């Protein structure tokens, strides 16, 4: 009916969203090294902070913090159809709420990461111009992942089912993307947003 909502969300942060259920089994979360206790001095409470590469030590640099998750026995729950373990990777400052080893159900947020016009308007639109910072898509289909850190600027991966696997593609750190290297990805599919 009129005036009912339909659709409620948070823009603040995105979250990270179990896709089977299950329990939580942290992964290279090592404090110290990947993860932080950050507190909240004006509400007290206290939240597992994922740490960036770069405000790593050398070894939490090549460690992937992840959230596994297993069954009761402790074996790996694939996802449903895609058949490839669900282990979420967390990225750097992502907040993580969940306990270790707590039931958890499929859809569950594990994670949460912080978030012209007139004439020159037509004039730009008819010469074709390249805006500041371009939306970056998928060139080809398939599994997606990373690569390379820090090697002047980052890379990535794709791989294709049946296609070229040694393609890649480079993408600055610098800028806050929202590629899912355990999701695939479309070639009609959006990158970085603008």
Same mark, same amino acid.
């Given at each position: 009916?009129? *005036?009912?909502?339909?659709?409620? +969300?948070?823009?603040? $942060?995105?979250?990270?969203?179990?896709?089977?259920?299950?329990?939580?089994?942290?992964?290279?979360?090592?404090?110290?090294? &990947?993860? $932080? #206790?950050?507190?909240?001095?004006? &509400?007290?409470?206290?939240?597992?902070?994922?740490?960036?590469?770069?405000? #790593?030590?050398?070894?939490?640099?090549?460690?992937?913090?992840?959230?596994?998750?297993? !069954?009761?026995?402790?074996?790996? =729950?694939?996802?449903?159809? &895609?058949?490839?373990?669900? %282990?979420?990777?967390?990225?750097?400052?992502?907040?993580?709420?969940?306990?270790?080893?707590? %039931?958890?159900?499929? *859809?569950? $947020?594990?994670?949460?990461?912080? %978030? $012209?016009?007139?004439?020159? #308007?037509?004039? !730009?639109?008819?010469?074709? #111009? /390249?805006?500041?910072?371009?939306?970056?898509?998928?060139?080809?289909?398939?599994? =997606?992942?990373?690569?390379?850190? &820090?090697?002047?600027? /980052?890379?990535?991966?794709?791989?294709?089912?049946?296609?070229?696997?040694?393609?890649?593609?480079?993408?600055?750190? +610098? /800028?806050?993307?929202?590629?899912?290297?355990?999701?695939?990805?479309?070639?009609?599919?959006?990158?970085?947003?603008?």
């Amino acid at each position: 009916a009129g *005036g009912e909502t339909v659709a409620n +969300w948070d823009p603040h $942060t995105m979250p990270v969203i179990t896709e089977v259920s299950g329990f939580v089994r942290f992964t290279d979360m090592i404090d110290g090294q &990947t993860i $932080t #206790r950050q507190t909240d001095e004006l &509400t007290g409470l206290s939240s597992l902070v994922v740490l960036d590469s770069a405000e #790593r030590t050398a070894g939490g640099k090549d460690l992937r913090p992840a959230l596994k998750i297993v !069954d009761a026995q402790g074996n790996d =729950v694939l996802i449903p159809g &895609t058949d490839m373990p669900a %282990q979420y990777f967390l990225p750097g400052k992502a907040i993580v709420q969940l306990e270790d080893g707590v %039931q958890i159900s499929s *859809g569950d $947020t594990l994670a949460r990461i912080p %978030q $012209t016009g007139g004439l020159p #308007r037509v004039a !730009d639109l008819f010469e074709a #111009r /390249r805006p500041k910072e371009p939306a970056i898509l998928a060139e080809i289909s398939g599994i =997606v992942s990373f690569g390379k850190e &820090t090697k002047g600027k /980052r890379r990535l991966v794709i791989t294709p089912v049946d296609g070229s696997d040694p393609y890649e593609e480079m993408i600055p750190k +610098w /800028r806050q993307l929202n590629v899912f290297e355990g999701e695939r990805v479309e070639r009609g599919d959006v990158i970085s947003d603008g």
